[PDB]
């Protein structure tokens, strides 16, 4: 059997695509055969995303594995909910409920607020960015207004790259003017590195400060520079390297060559590529469960236009979504099981702290506890 899917990868996601290839070649079974059509594009441009989605719907794909940015969430979600085409996305979970979007990144607002309450913080700064939406910002603001905190929220997204040092220095001077010893960084692996370099330049990594890296990847960034600074920093970690599955994967991942698999010759692994591996596993398991129950999901090449009127959804889309949401497996990110809305439930986030000898796990946050 041939089950055609589609792949929407951003311009620059090399390690993610390498992990996708590793998962495709590793999880292949005999019940079917995935034939993904890859289409690298710019996810932040809604026009290119619409063009790629229509191009891949013109082939009659079954699902579409792809990323999206805050400027393209609505296009992807609306097209998927209207045309009845699933969408496995390792990006941030959309705000609210959205059918036919099988999100893969576990939530962080709960664990973030739990860590804030654990450290018993009352006044702190919160440097955020509008890349992954403004859900965490609103959650933090509401929790602070309910628990009477002093949050100093600052958008560091408009920092231009030509004179970033001056703006960062002025920002940290203004933060010191209010005596802000606690800072929560909510950025990706690049803005976090930039802010860390600026902190080191301005000399604030000395003992007496505390930072919280608000992202599922702690060891992804450059931590060998703040480790010996004196200040204690904490963060979250979805993919732990102490498990047996992650260890067996890394033992066969660091040995790969960077020429064939770009970004593979490394000991660590970004959590987005781990979610990509798990997404390949989840699609394979869903197709196996559909083929085991003898569900004839074979659709002819009558896909036709992409923006037809009226947009008629095929009768097998809801079946594929139901089979994809009812998949419970164990992967690199941990236990994978989705609720009715597609969001991830029953996960586990390993909270880490950067000691002088390295990051050490101090506990695990869940949703039931």
């Amino acid at each position, epitope marked *: *059997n*041939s089950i*055609q899917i589609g792949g929407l990868f951003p311009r620059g996601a090399d390690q993610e695509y390498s992990a996708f*290839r590793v998962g*495709m*070649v*590793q*999880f*292949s*079974t*005999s*019940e079917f*055969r995935l*034939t993904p*059509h*890859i289409d690298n594009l710019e996810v932040a441009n809604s026009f290119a995303v619409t063009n790629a989605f229509c191009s891949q719907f013109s*082939r009659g794909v079954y699902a579409i594995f792809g990323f999206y940015d805050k400027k393209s969430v609505n296009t992807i979600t609306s097209f998927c909910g209207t045309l009845h085409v699933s969408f496995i996305t390792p990006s941030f979970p959309t705000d609210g409920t959205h059918p036919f979007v099988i999100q893969m990144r576990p939530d962080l607002k709960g664990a973030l607020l739990s860590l804030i309450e654990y450290y018993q913080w009352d006044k702190f700064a919160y440097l955020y960015d509008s890349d992954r939406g403004l859900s965490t910002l609103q959650a933090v603001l509401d929790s602070a207004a309910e628990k009477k905190w002093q949050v100093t929220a600052i958008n560091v997204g408009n920092i231009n790259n030509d004179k970033k040092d001056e703006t960062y220095r002025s920002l940290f001077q203004d933060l010191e003017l209010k005596k802000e010893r606690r800072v929560i960084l909510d950025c990706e692996r690049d803005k976090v590195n930039d802010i860390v370099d600026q902190v080191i330049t301005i000399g604030k990594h000395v003992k007496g400060y505390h930072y919280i890296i608000a992202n599922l990847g702690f060891t992804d960034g450059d931590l060998l520079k703040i480790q010996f600074g004196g200040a204690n920093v904490s963060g979250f970690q979805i993919v732990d390297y102490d498990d047996s599955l992650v260890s067996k994967f890394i033992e*066969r991942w660091s040995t790969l060559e960077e*020429k*064939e698999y770009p970004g593979a010759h490394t000991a660590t692994i970004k959590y987005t590529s781990a979610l990509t591996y798990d997404a390949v596993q989840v699609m394979t398991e869903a197709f196996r469960n559909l083929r085991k129950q003898r569900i004839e999901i074979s659709r002819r*090449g009558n896909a036709g236009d992409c923006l037809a009127n009226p947009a008629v959804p095929w009768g097998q889309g809801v079946e594929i979504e139901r089979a994809l949401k009812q998949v419970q497996v164990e992967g690199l990110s941990g236990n994978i099981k989705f609720d009715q809305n597609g969001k991830r439930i029953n996960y586990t986030i390993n909270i880490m702290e950067l000691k002088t000898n390295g990051p050490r796990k101090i506990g695990y946050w869940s949703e039931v506890d």
Partner: antibody
Framework: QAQLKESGPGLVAPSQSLSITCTVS????????VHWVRQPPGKGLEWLGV???????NYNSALMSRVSISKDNSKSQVFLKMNSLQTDDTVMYYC?????????????WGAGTTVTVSS | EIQMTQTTSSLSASLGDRVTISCRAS??????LSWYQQKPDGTVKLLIY???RLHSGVPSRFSGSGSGIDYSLTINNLEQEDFATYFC?????????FGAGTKLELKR
């Protein structure tokens, strides 16, 4: 560098079984799958079967009653045991390792050993 | 089974020329074709994957094109090493069928 060295008997009695082996060096037989092809004299190769990395094997609808691939991940080997090898069934049997880079390609292909089942 | 059948059975052209071997499939292979090269000694190797892109480390002279059923691989400037058989496979469904291909020879 991943390489499959197809080592076979080279000759066998008529209507008798024929067992060849392939020892993939550099590629773990549990992570990447193997696929066997048969090229006749001066003709295009025909895929006989494949033993996926998960352990499940899928064979061609023609040689299904004859071909049977069995993998040993510990010894890192894949053996093809085709019984009732006829004189016309004597062709160059080769083994390759599939990959995935924007399409399902067979990257590393073994040199293959000639087999002429004749009494 | 998608029976990928090559167009020309055999071709002959001297060095310094550009040849183009074409193949056609039964059903739509969805541009998931691959052109490989088989030498006389038995050594096979990949030349063009996904019917559009050449493999890693292949000679830049050889290229591919053609979407749908028909797909053609064209050599830019022939040479002595380019004189070998060229086969085509369609990895869109099982059993993966390969084409007999044509062997380019040196015109004398």
């Amino acid at each position: 560098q991943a390489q499959l060295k197809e080592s076979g008997p080279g000759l066998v009695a008529p209507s008798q079984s024929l067992s060849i082996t392939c020892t993939v060096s550099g590629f773990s037989l549990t992570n990447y799958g193997v696929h066997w092809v048969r090229q006749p004299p001066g003709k295009g190769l025909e895929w006989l079967g494949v033993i996926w990395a998960g352990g499940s094997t899928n064979y061609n609808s023609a040689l299904m009653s004859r071909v049977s691939i069995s993998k040993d991940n510990s010894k890192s080997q894949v053996f093809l045991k085709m019984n009732s090898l006829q004189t016309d069934d004597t062709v160059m049997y080769y083994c390759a390792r599939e990959d995935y880079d924007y399409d399902w390609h067979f990257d590393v292909w073994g040199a293959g050993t000639t087999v002429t089942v004749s009494s | 089974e998608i029976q990928m059948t090559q167009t020309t059975s055999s071709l002959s052209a001297s060095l310094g020329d550009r040849v183009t071997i074409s193949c056609r499939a039964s059903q739509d292979i969805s541009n998931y074709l691959s052109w490989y090269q088989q030498k006389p000694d038995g050594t096979v190797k990949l030349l063009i994957y996904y019917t559009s892109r050449l493999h890693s480390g292949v000679p830049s002279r050889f290229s591919g094109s053609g979407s749908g059923i028909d797909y053609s691989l064209t050599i830019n400037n022939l040479e002595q090493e380019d004189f070998a058989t060229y086969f085509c496979q369609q990895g869109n469904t099982l059993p993966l069928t390969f084409g007999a291909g044509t062997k380019l020879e040196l015109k004398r």
